[PDB]
């Protein structure tokens, strides 16, 4: 909505209640204070400048008066429009705005903490405090280790064992995912080379050929272009085959719809296995799985820990397993802690499993012992 | 990540390139300008204050110098941490930041070379609402086996050529993540409930007593209006206003409501205890709340057109649809398959076990007057 004001009209005065702000589309306006009939100019605003935001942002009165220097045309921005856009902005951006506002007139402790935590995470990465552990994936019927998932671990000397609940999300929607993710993939692929070599050296030739290293890939690093180029470079570096490398993704990817179907279809043509991690939670979902080069899906612990108790959870799990089979997708059920859970999941048709029942995540050295 | 500076150290000078910002953890710093060797104090900052952000936000030089007044400890905030959060922010927020920055740094004329358009579109939408340009149409939901109209969905329409150059989805989206959803949504619900009263009265007056009792008016409820407190109070007020029963009113909700998890289960259980029917509008698209579907007062789920239009062509889409239908039955949830445009689609969906359907095959959305005629057939 657009409004035309004549030259010399006082649009509002210092000390008035704020109703709305205004974006100048044509002409010029003067911002002034008055102090005993002496008019003190602050500035002249022209096309594109917004004015009157300040009263709206923190329900104070007008900090200055505003007069049209010539005929002007103003677009009206409402209190609610400004408050809405501000309240939904990033909390560090909200902090930055509050500090600027208060200085110009002359959730903060949560926002400073987020900034600090990020810097603490990345310094710990560069101080070599992270390592990968490996959690066996087992064939449910014959109890054989068929692969492993690479899981990030923070062994901070000050705090002891730092929980992945904290730092994984910070890492994943931060630019540091790219350097951290490049390190993860290289390490996983390096340790895959070692697992295969050791398996062969102990005459388990077929196990080595069929072994799947499962690597968690975030959306950010997946949609970063040349992700596939670096992934390929790192595979050839360690002389590995695509068929032994499974890329675990959260369905939040498909979100990027056609684009996604893109790289995912890319990799699949190279022979990488693609897996939907935490299926049925998050945006890890049914609708896109219809048209996806998906070889695996993981049934989240949240379902598995309710199999025996809540029989409506047993229904949902059977549905997912039977659906996966109808699309020739195989299933890994994770969070398996009891033999009774593994029994039921095998009867329902899940081929693979992971969890404490079989083994917790362990360092490479202990994993190399488990496979023997 | 933490750095200790001695009393009197110039941390940086006015005119330098910005590397990082700092949070003061201990002590005090002076912000000053220099103007012919006269040092002009702007302020003293203490514990918790941030400084040096401004150069980072828009790659300008330092607007002032900063000296430690005593021994200080600074936490480092990186250029990268500021620039990412700033560059990804809303364009109105970006405008606000630029204006504040320039004003704090500051007779010449200040200028700024979308944004204004987003603001205007919203005001155009809301003025059209208040100028009575919106109305509800109703699309029959039919029992697939016996072809009988069992209910209808209320669908919002804008009667203007302007609806037009926005896109049909887009005007609904503007409404739904804007505060205007509350006044627009209150009008929608009242109108739908008013027109439900009329459908039932006419059904009774023609001795179709069982049809009137079983008739479901389906109303799309956005997340914003659902999580707004006193949503249930207004909904109840409007039901009693039109002397209606909860059992005839179905609340269609996006699956994205389950991003609240525990809070969402309670809010739905509140409506369900009152006797409202709850339906998941877009099942299997958008947010996956299947872990939660285990414990949800859900009576209906709708299979989206995006699945239905791929049944015959892409047989992996046929697989997913059968799975959803069979799963819904295992939880005593009934299914409405929407976007049904051909008899062959309705055939397949009935064989798979879907009870209800909507789409062009049966009828497009129509005004109340035409809907009242369709009922009598
Ligand atoms: N306080 C202040 N406001 C300014 C300045 N330059 C432009 N303005 C605008 O003038 C407006 C006066 O009313 P508000 O306080 O609502 O919002 C103010 C700003 O939008 C300045 O240097 N100081
Ligand atoms: N320009 C300006 N900067 C201030 C003021 N008060 C505190 N500061 C801080 O001083 C810093 C000087 O360098 P920057 O411009 O990078 O960031 C500035 C702000 O963080 C003030 O009144 N004006
Ligand atoms: Mg996983
Ligand atoms: Mg709908």
Numbering used by the authors:
A (entry chain B): 6 to 111, 136 to 401
B (entry chain A): 6 to 111, 117 to 123, 139 to 402
List sentences from the manuscript.
We reveal that regulation of c‐di‐GMP hydrolysis arises from a domain‐swapping of the “regular” cNMP fold, which undergoes significant rearrangements upon binding of stimulus, communicating a series of conformational changes over 40 Å to license a productive state at the EAL dimer interface. C‐di‐GMP turnover was increased ~8‐fold in the presence of cAMP or cGMP, further supporting the proposal that cNMPs are activators of Bd1971.
The crystal structure of full‐length Bd1971 was solved with both cAMP and cGMP ligands, to resolutions of 2.63 and 2.46 Å, respectively. These two co‐crystal structures are effectively identical other than small differences at the ligand binding pocket that are discussed later. The linear extension is only resolved in the higher resolution cGMP dataset and has relatively weak electron density for side chain residues; we have estimated the amino acid register in this region from physical attributes and conservation patterns of the segment, but it remains ambiguous. Dimer of full‐length cGMP‐bound Bd1971; one monomer colored individually by subdomain, the opposing monomer colored white. The nucleotide‐bound pocket of Bd1971ΔEAL‐mid reveals cAMP to be bound in the syn conformation; of the two full‐length, bound‐state structures of Bd1971, this pose resembles the cGMP complex (syn) more closely than the cAMP complex (anti). However, both the anti‐cAMP and syn cGMP conformations allow for the side chain of Met59 to occupy the “down” rotamer that stacks with the nucleotide base, whereas the syn cAMP Bd1971ΔEAL‐mid conformation places Met59 in a conformation more similar to the full‐length apo structure. The other notable difference between the Bd1971 anti‐cAMP and syn GMP complexes is that Ser68 can make a specific interaction to N2 of the guanine ring —protein kinases specific for cGMP often encode a Ser/Thr at this position in contrast to cAMP‐specific domains utilizing Ala (Osborne et al, 2011). The similarity in binding pose between an anti‐cAMP and syn cGMP has been observed in some other cNMP sensor proteins, including CRP, where the cAMP N6 and cGMP O6 occupy similar positions (Passner et al, 2000; Seok et al, 2014).
